[PDB]
């Protein structure tokens, strides 16, 4: 009686979903991942007369998200999909990673747009003499992607964050005790054409994203950062992993717990563009330390 | 340059506070622990014309908290301190635990009151017949209601509980991992309590290691008090998470707690025969009180 046949077709299985206790072959795993992503996005995102910008970085996540989104919008006529790669401009890596994303876009017919850090910002790599490097990079990338999505007049900005990436970030915000970082995430419903950040992979674990990348034979590139290595996220990932390894569905209950939390919690800027308040811009804080550069509003 | 002299007096040290990177001798550590507890309680708790009931269970925490509170209220003329021991009646050796707590109350002159679970309707002489849920949860929930009803009976202003920084960081993390917002809703709302006696935790910001070190220096005769009918492995797993986080990032337990304190201040704000209620449906928090036990007027 206790075998390993597929839950949907009773055929030999390739994946045992440790959370649910369900076995899935190649075909049934792809179908249930597509179903879960279709559920995550909803009918507001998956419909006609919709333009979706997507932040691609060459890794498994971006390419897996890019492939799934393309499969849906391929069978929708007036529903465009644009790919944005943001070249940080490092002497070490970054050059490799975007190459795998560009070659994917060519092979699958996705309109790509490579935008550089050394364009919107004057300095390509490091503001050496003081201030956090990995954070600075992520904050700017978000503002660049928002500005490119507005420029291309996109309805949504798709980001390849998986359930592990979200569970880690939630747990990090919990361990750090950040309520100010939790506050900025609060006002993210619908704002002045401020392109809505969608995460199609938000409920798919890293292992499933990786397994889906292997089965689709997607030529993804890891691209390790030569100027940033935060050991806290790798420590937090081990916490969430060991929690999942002892209690299946921990990562989901951690995330669902933050989703419920964010519901029950209660353009302003200078020169550039609105994000929260005028005061002294959080992005232009590092800009003030050097000198303000091109690309701004009226 | 790099020695080990005391941060407050420059004398050889007995404790290295791994989170602050500071060193304290016996006298300076006792003084900084007393200062932190004085800070946790405030002027409203540490003043004249108040009575403080305190849940004692015989362990280092309850005795350390009982000793500190007694030191303060000893010099305060019009302020009282009552100790309440709750024998759950769940057989085994709970008696040896209360024995250490009673013998402290005798040696230090604190008015003690031993109250039973069986005395407040039911039995619980191992009642679960064939902290998270079912046996361990039901015990903790009742204990709270018994302690509240003994404090009301003695007309106390506050109910002191021996929860330490480790105890508090773990519970917060458990509530985070479980994703409980309904259990988070119970905390707060009832901030303007009518009949409910205010639950104070003097040890709330003192880590378990400091509480234990303070117990050793004061030569307190505390009892181990182990449970023969409850062992929840999740809290022991969570404690290891909070410990390994502290061991790699000093002050993690405090930032986890301070993060929950800041969260609870910016968050969203029928029980027949007994009472409690306060924006809650059916038995409020009373696990059952129906069929298996009943017994009502
Ligand atoms: S790891 Fe590198 S590319 Fe990623 S946010 Fe940090 S600095 Fe930027
Ligand atoms: S460990 Fe034992 S005494 Fe403590 S709450 Fe659980 S059942 Fe009650
Ligand atoms: Zn199948
Ligand atoms: Zn700005
Ligand atoms: Zn000293
Ligand atoms: Zn009741």
Author numbering:
A (entry chain B): 1 to 129, 138 to 274, 280 to 311
B (entry chain A): 1 to 130, 137 to 275, 281 to 308
Extract from the study:
Thiolation of uridine 34 in the anticodon loop of several tRNAs is conserved in the three domains of life and guarantees fidelity of protein translation. We report here spectroscopic and biochemical experiments showing that NcsA from Methanococcus maripaludis (MmNcsA) is a dimer that binds a [4Fe-4S] cluster, which is required for catalysis.
The crystals belong to space group P212121 and contain two molecules in the asymmetric unit that form a dimer. The [4Fe-4S] cluster is chelated by three conserved cysteines only: Cys142, Cys145, and Cys233. Remarkably, while three Fe atoms are attached to the protein via these 3 cysteines, the fourth iron completes its coordination with a non-protein, exogenous ligand, as revealed by an electron density adjacent to that Fe atom. Based on the diffraction data at only one wavelength, it is not possible to distinguish between a water molecule, a hydrogenosulfide ion, a chloride ion or the oxygen atom of a sulfate molecule, which all could be refined with B-factors in the same range as those for the protein. Note that several sulfate ions originating from the crystallization solution were observed within the active site. Superposition of the MmNcsA and PhTtuA catalytic cores shows that the two proteins adopt the same fold but highlights different orientations of the terminal zinc-containing domains relative to the catalytic core. In both molecules of the asymmetric unit, two loops (residues 130–137 and 275–280), for which there was no electron density, were not modelled.
